[PDB]
Coordinates of C-alpha atoms and ligand atoms in Angstrom, one line a residue:
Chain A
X202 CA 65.4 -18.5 -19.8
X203 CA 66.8 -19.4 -16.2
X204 CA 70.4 -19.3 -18.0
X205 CA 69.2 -15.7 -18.7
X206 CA 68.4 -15.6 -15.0
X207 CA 71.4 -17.7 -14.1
X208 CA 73.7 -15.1 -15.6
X209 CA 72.7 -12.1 -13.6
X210 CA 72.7 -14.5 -10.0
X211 CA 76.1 -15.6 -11.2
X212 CA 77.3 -11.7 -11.8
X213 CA 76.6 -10.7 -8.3
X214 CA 79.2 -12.9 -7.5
X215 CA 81.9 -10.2 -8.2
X216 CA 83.6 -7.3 -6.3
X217 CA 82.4 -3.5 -5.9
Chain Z
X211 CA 78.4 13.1 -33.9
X212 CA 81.0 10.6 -32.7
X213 CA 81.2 6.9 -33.1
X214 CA 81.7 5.6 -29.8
X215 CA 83.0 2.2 -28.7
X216 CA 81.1 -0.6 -27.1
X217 CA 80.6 1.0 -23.2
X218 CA 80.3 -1.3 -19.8
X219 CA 79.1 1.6 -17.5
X220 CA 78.8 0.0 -13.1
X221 CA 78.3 1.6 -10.0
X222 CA 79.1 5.6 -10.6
X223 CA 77.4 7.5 -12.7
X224 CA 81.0 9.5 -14.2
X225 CA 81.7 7.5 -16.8
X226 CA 78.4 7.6 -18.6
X227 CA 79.0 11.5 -19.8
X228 CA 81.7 9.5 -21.7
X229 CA 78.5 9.2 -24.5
X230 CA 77.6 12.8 -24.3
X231 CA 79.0 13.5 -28.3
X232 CA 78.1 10.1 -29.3
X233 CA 75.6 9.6 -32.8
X234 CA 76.3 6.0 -33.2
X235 CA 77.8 3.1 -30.3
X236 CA 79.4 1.1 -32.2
X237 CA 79.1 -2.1 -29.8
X238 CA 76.3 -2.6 -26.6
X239 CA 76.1 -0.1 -24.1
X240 CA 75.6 -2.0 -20.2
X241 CA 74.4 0.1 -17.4
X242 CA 74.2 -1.4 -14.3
X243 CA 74.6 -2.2 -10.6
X244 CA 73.4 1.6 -9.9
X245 CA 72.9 1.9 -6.2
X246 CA 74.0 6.0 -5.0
X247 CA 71.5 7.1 -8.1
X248 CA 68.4 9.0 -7.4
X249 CA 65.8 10.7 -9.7
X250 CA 68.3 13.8 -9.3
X251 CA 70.8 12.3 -10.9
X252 CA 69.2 11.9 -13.7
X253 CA 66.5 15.3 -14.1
X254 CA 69.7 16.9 -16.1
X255 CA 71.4 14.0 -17.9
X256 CA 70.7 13.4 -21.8
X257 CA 72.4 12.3 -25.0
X258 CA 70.2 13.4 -27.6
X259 CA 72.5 12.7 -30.4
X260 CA 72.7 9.1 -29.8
X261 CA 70.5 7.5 -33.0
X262 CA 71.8 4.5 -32.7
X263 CA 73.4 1.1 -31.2
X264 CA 75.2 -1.9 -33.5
X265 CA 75.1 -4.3 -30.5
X266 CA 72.4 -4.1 -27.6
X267 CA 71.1 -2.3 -25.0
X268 CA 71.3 -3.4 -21.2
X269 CA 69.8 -1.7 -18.0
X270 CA 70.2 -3.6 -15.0
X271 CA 69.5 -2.6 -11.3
X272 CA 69.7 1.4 -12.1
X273 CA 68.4 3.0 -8.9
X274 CA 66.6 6.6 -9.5
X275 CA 66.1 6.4 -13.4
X276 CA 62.0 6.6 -13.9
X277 CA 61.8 7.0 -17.8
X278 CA 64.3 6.8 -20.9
X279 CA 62.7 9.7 -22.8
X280 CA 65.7 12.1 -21.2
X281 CA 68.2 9.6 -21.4
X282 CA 67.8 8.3 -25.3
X283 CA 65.1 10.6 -26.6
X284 CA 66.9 10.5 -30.2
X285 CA 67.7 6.5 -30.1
X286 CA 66.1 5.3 -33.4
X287 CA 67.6 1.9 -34.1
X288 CA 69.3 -1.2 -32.4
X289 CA 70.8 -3.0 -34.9
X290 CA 71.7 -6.5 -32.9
X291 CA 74.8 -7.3 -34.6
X292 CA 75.7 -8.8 -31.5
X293 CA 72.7 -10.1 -29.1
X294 CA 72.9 -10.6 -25.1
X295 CA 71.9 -14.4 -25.8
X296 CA 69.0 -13.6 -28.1
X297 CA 68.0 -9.9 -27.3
X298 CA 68.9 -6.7 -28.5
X299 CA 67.3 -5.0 -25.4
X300 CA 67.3 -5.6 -21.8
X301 CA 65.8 -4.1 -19.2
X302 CA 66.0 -5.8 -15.9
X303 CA 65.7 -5.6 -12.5
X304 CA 64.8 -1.8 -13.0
X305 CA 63.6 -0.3 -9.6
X306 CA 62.2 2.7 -10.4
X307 CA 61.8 2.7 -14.0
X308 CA 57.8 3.7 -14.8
X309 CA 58.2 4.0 -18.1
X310 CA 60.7 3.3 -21.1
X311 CA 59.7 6.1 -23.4
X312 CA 62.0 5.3 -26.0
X313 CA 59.3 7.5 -28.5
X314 CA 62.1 7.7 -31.5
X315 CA 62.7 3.6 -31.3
X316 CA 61.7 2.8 -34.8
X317 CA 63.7 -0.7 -35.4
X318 CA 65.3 -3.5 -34.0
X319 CA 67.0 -5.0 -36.8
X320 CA 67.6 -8.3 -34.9
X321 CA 66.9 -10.1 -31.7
X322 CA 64.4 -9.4 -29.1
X323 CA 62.9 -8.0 -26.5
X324 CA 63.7 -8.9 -22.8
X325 CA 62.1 -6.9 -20.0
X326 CA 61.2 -8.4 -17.0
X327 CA 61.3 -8.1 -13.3
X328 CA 60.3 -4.0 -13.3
X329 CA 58.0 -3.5 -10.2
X330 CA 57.1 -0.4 -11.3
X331 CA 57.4 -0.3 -15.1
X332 CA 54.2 0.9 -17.0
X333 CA 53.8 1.9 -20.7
X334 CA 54.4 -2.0 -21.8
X335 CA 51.2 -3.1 -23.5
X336 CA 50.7 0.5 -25.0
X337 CA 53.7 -0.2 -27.7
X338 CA 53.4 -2.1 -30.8
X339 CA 56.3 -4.3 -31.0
X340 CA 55.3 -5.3 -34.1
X341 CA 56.3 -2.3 -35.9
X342 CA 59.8 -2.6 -34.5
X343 CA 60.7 -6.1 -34.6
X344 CA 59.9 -8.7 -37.8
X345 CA 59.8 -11.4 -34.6
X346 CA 58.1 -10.8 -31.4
X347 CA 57.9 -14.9 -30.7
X348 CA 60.9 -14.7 -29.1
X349 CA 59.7 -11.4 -27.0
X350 CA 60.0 -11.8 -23.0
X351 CA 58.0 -9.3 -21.2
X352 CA 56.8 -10.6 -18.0
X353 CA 56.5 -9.7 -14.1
X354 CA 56.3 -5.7 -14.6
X355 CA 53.7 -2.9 -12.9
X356 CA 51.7 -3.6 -16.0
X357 CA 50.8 -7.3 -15.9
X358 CA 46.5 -3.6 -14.3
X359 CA 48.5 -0.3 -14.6
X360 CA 46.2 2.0 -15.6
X361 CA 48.8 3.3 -19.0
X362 CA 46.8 6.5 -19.9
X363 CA 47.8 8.1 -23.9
X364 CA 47.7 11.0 -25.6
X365 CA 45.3 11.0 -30.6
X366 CA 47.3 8.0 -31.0
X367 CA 47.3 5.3 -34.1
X368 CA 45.5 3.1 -32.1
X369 CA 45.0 -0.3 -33.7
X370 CA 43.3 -3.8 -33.3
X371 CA 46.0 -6.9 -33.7
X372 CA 44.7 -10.3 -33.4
X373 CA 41.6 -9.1 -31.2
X374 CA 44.0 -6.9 -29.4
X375 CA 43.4 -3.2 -28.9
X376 CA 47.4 -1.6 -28.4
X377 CA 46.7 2.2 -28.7
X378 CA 50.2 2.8 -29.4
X379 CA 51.7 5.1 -26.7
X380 CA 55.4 5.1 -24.5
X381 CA 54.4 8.0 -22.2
X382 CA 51.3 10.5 -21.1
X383 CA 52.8 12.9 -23.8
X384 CA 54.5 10.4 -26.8
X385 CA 52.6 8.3 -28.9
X386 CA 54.5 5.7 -31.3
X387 CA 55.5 7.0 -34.7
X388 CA 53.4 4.8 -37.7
X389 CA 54.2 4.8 -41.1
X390 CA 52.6 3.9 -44.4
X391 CA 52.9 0.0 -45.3
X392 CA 54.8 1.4 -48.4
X393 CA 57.2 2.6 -46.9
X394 CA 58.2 -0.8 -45.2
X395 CA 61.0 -0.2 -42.3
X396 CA 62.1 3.0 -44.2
X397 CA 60.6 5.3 -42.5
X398 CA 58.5 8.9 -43.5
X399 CA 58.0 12.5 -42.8
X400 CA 55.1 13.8 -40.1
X401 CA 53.4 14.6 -43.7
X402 CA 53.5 10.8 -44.6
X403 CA 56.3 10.5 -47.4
X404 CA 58.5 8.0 -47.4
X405 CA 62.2 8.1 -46.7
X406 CA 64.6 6.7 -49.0
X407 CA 64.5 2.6 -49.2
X408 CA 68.5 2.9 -48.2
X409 CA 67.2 4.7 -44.6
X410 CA 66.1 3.0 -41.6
X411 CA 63.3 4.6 -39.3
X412 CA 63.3 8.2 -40.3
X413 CA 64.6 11.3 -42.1
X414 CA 64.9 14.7 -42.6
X415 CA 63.6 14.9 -45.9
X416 CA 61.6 12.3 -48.1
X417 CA 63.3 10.2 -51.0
X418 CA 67.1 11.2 -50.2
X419 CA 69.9 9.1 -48.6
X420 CA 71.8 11.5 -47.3
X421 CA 68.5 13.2 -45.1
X422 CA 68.5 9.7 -43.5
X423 CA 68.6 9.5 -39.8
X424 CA 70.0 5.8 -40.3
X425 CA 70.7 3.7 -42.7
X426 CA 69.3 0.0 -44.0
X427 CA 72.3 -1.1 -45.0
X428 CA 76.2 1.0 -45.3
X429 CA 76.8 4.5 -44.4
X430 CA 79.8 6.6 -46.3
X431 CA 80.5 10.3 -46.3
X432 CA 76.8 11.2 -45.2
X433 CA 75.3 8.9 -47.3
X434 CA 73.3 5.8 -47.0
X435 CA 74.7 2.9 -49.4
X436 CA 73.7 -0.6 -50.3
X437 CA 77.3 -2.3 -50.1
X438 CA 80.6 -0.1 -50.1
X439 CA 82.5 0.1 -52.9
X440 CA 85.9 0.4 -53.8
X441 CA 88.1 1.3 -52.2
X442 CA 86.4 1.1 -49.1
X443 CA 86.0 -1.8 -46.6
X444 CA 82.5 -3.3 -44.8
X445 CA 83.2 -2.6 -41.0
X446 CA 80.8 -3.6 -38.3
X447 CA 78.1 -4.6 -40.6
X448 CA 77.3 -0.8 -40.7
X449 CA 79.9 1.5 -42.3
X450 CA 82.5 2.2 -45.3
X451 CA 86.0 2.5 -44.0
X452 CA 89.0 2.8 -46.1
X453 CA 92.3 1.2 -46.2
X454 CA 94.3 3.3 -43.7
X455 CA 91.4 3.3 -41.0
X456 CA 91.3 -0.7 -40.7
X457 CA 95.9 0.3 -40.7
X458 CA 95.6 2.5 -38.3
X459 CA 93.3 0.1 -35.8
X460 CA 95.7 -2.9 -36.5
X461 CA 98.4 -0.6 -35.1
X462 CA 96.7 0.6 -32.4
X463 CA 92.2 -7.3 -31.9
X464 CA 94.8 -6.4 -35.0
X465 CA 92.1 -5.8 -37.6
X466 CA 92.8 -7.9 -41.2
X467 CA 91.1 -7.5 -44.5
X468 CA 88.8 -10.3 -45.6
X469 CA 86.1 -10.6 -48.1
X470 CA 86.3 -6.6 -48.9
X471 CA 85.1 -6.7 -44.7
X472 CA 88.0 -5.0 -42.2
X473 CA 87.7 -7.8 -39.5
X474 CA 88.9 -8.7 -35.7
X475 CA 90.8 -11.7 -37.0
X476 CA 91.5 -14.1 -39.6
X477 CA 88.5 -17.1 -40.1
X478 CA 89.7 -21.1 -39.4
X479 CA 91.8 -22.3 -42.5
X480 CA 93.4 -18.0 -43.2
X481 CA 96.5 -16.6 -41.8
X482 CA 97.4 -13.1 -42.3
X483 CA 99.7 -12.0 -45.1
X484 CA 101.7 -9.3 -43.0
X485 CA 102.3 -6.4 -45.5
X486 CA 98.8 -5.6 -46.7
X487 CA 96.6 -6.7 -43.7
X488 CA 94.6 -9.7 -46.2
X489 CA 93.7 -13.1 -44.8
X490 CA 95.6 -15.8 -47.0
X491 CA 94.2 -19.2 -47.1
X492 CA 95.8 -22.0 -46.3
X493 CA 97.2 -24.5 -48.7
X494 CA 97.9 -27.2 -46.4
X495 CA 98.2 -26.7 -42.6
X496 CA 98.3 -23.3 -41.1
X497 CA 101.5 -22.2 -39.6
Ligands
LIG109 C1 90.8 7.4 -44.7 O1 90.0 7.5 -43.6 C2 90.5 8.3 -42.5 C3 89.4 8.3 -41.4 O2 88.3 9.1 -41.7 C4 87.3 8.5 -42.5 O3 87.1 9.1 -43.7 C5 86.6 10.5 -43.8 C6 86.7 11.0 -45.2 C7 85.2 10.5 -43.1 O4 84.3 9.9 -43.9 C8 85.3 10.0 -41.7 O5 84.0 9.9 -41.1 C9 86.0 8.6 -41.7 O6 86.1 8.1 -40.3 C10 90.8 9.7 -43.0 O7 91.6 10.5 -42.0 C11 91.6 9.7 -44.3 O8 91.8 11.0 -44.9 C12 90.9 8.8 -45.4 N1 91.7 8.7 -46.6 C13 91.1 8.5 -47.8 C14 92.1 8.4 -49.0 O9 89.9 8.2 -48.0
NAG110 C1 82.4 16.4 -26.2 O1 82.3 17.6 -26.9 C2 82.6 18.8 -26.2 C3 82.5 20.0 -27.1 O2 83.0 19.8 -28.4 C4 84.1 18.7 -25.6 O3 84.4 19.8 -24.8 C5 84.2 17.4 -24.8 O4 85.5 17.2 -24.3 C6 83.7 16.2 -25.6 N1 83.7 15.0 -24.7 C7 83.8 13.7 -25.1 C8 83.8 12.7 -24.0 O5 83.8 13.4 -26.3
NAG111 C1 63.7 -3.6 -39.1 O1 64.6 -3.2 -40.2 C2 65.0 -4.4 -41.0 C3 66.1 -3.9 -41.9 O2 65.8 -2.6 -42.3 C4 63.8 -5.0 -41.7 O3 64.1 -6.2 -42.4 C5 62.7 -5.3 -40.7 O4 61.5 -5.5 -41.4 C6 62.4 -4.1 -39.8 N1 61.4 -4.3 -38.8 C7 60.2 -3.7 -38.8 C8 59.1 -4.3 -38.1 O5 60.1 -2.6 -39.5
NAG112 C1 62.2 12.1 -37.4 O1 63.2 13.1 -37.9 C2 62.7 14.4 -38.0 C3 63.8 15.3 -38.6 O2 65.1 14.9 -38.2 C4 62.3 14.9 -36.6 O3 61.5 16.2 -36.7 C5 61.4 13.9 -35.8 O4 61.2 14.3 -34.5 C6 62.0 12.5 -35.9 N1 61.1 11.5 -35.2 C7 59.9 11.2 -35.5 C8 59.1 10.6 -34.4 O5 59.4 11.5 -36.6

């Protein structure tokens, strides 16, 4: 859905 | 080949020949967040021993991969055990991907299907999902290439569903495997003959569990089994293991015995009688 969406957004909000 | 653990593979590419003696991933196997890749990368890299995942399978942002058919050219089932919300494959965000070519997917023996957001991705309305998944409701396979493509087949069991033509096809030079309606999710040989009812997707030889290339239900000792039976122990929803294997990973979650299952820990209202790994129920509170 846009939790599915909301999940991978929310990811790219980590450190590499 | 090896049982391999659950995998999580980001960024470099090294890890990933982690899987290259791996039959079975016995968890979901992540790649993603793949930005030095190019098509290079990946001309020379393939597990063709993988048959199978318990969990899912997840391909996110993998720069340079064009096609799975090098990558998992062997990969027959996805058993869903555990689901990425409600799917048992992702593919997302996928660059460069033209194709899946998974050709030996036979099964998907829960969950769905999520692929979306694949700019180039082709190949899509050529497979029958039907014949993989008992639900494709719950399918999600939107904004790709191939919402106009131009996906060109093989000589294929082309079909009508609903007043659909699928011609049944994942590249140029694969079409989908079909089997009789009696042999139901079993699987067959290229001359027709059905593989054992304790297989799943294919075999090696017709009416034998131990030609199976996976099973319906429990695999022990190169067999395919309905339940396991003493004095072995259900583990992952998938194989036998005895005793001293569900010892030796408690030593090593600390793994208990309940309900003739080796588990990752004790259900609400159990606590773990120490000396013999078996959840206890609880007569009164729970200490
Ligand atoms: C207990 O299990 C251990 C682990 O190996 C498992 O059993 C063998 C026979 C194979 O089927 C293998 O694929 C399994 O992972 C063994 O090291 C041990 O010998 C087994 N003992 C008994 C009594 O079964
Ligand atoms: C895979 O198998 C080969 C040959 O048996 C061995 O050299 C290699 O170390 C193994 N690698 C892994 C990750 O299992
Ligand atoms: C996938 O396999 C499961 C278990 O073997 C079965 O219930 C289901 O019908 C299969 N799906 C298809 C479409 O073959
Ligand atoms: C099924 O298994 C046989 C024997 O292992 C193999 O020849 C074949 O390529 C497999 N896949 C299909 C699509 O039949």
């Amino acid at each position: 859905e846009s939790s599915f969406r909301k999940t991978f957004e929310d990811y790219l909000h980590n450190v590499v | 080949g090896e049982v391999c653990p659950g995998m999580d593979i980001r960024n470099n590419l090294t890890r990933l020949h982690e899987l290259e003696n791996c039959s079975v991933i016995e968890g979901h196997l992540q790649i993603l967040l793949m930005f030095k890749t190019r098509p290079e990368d990946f001309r020379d890299l393939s597990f063709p021993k993988l048959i199978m995942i318990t969990d899912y399978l997840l391909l996110f942002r993998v720069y340079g991969l064009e096609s799975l058919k090098d990558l998992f050219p062997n990969l027959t089932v996805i058993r869903g055990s555990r689901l990425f919300f409600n799917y048992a494959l992702v593919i997302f965000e996928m660059v460069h991907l033209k194709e899946l070519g998974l050709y030996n997917l036979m099964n998907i023996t829960r969950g769905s299907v999520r692929i979306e957001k694949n700019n180039e991705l082709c190949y899509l309305a050529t497979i029958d999902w039907s014949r993989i998944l008992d639900s494709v409701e719950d399918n999600h396979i939107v904004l790709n290439k191939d919402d106009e493509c131009g996906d060109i087949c093989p000589n294929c069991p082309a079909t009508v569903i609903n007043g659909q033509f699928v011609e049944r096809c994942w590249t140029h030079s694969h079409c989908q495997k079909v089997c009789p309606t009696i042999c139901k999710s079993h699987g067959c040989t290229a001359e027709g003959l059905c593989c054992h009812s304790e297989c799943l997707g294919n075999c090696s030889q017709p009416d034998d569990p131990t030609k199976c290339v996976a099973c319906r239900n429990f695999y022990l000792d190169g067999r395919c089994v309905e339940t396991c039976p003493p004095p072995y122990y259900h583990f992952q929803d998938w194989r036998c293991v005895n005793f001293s294997f569900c010892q030796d990973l408690h030593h090593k979650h600390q793994y208990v015995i309940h309900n003739n299952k080796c588990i990752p820990e004790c259900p609400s209202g159990y606590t773990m009688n120490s000396s013999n790994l078996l959840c206890t129920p609880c007569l009164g509170p729970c200490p």
